[PDB]
Amino acid sequence: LSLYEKMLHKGMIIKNSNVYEKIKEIDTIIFNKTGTLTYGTPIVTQFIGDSLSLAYAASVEALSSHPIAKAIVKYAKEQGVKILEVKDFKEISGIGVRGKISDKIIEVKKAENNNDIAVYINGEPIASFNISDVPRPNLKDYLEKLKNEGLKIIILSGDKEDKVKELSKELNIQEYYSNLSPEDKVRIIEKLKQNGNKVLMIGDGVNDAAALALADVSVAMGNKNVADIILVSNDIGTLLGLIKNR
Numbered sequence: 260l261s262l263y264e265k266m267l268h269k270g271m272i273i274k275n276s277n278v279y280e281k282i283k284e285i286d287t288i289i290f291n292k293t294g295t296l297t298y299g300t301p302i303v304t305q306f307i308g309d310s311l312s313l314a315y316a317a318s319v320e321a322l323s324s325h326p327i328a329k330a331i332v333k334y335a336k337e338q339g340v341k342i343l344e345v346k347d348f349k350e351i352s353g354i355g356v357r358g359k360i361s362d363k364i365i366e367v368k369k370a371e372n373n374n375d376i377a378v379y380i381n382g383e384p385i386a387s388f389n390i391s392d393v394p395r396p397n398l399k400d401y402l403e404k405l406k407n408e409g410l411k412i413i414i415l416s417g418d419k420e421d422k423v424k425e426l427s428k429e430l431n432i433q434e435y436y437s438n439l440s441p442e443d444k445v446r447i448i449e450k451l452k453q454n455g456n457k458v459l460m461i462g463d464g465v466n467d468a469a470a471l472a473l474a475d476v477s478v479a480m481g482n483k484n485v486a487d488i489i490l491v492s493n494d495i496g497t498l499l500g501l502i503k504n505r
């Protein structure tokens with residue numbers, strides 16, 4: 260069994276080659292929050308309103324396939340209400356969903372104040388949803404690496420200050436940057452390599468694609484062609500093993 264076979268057995272595909280000697284140098288670790296430190300999967304964390312309002316909103320969201328709509332529908336079914344028939348349905352990307360039941364106009368869209376999701380009935384907002392991501396069952400062995408070489412650990416996210424801080428508390432590392440953009444991330448990575456730091460970065464979806472390509476060693480989850488490594492196993496722990504045995 261080659262080095263490619265032994266690494267694959269341990270959940271890791273090595274597309275690169277010299278990546279092994281590169282890792283020895285690494286002094287800083289950066290996570291892109293969504294999809295790496297979480298499953299990247301919205302659920303409803305709270306609903307404010309009554310059951311009739313909840314059934315209307317689910318009925319209209321049942322005709323969409325956007326992951327926000329699927330989460331609302333699934334929450335409503337857990338609460339025991341059922342799906343009702345909708346006329347004149349229209350979906351409007353970037354905004355949300357609209358439709359007609361028992362002679363009332365129902366819209367579901369971003370709230371006028373927050374990132375909350377709001378339910379409008381004949382033009383008045385009568386209910387709302389708080390929607391969050393799902394955290395991977397933690398490895399406090401982050402601390403086992405905070406110990407090891409006392410490496411520097413950083414977290415980048417695009418989500419709002421409320422949401423990215425709470426996670427930064429859930430596990431204990433005191434250095435995160437929230438409210439970011441794909442090109443803001445690239446800027447911070449530059450600004451550190453431009454300080455001679457050797458960076459390993461872990462990423463997943465759309466945003467991180469670009470800063471991964473910018474990393475000394477880059478790692479992409481199992482769910483592009485830029486990553487030195489692929490965690491087909493989606494087991495962050497397995498990687499933490501690789502790091503603390505480098």
Ligand SMILES: C[C@H](OP(=O)(O)OP(=O)(O)OP(=O)(O)OC[C@H]1O[C@@H](n2cnc3c(N)ncnc32)[C@H](O)[C@@H]1O)c1ccccc1[N+](=O)[O-]
Pocket residue numbers: 293299300301302320323325326327328352353354355356367368369370374375376390391392
């Ligand atoms: C992917 C996900 O949500 P996201 O990343 O916000 O999806 P996005 O692509 O930015 O949405 P857009 O750009 O299509 O629509 C912009 C805004 O219009 C509203 N909006 C849009 N569609 C709808 C709808 N069907 N119903 C209600 N409101 C809607 C709504 O207020 C939406 O934010 C999610 C959520 C939580 C955790 C983790 C993940 N995750 O990444 O897996």
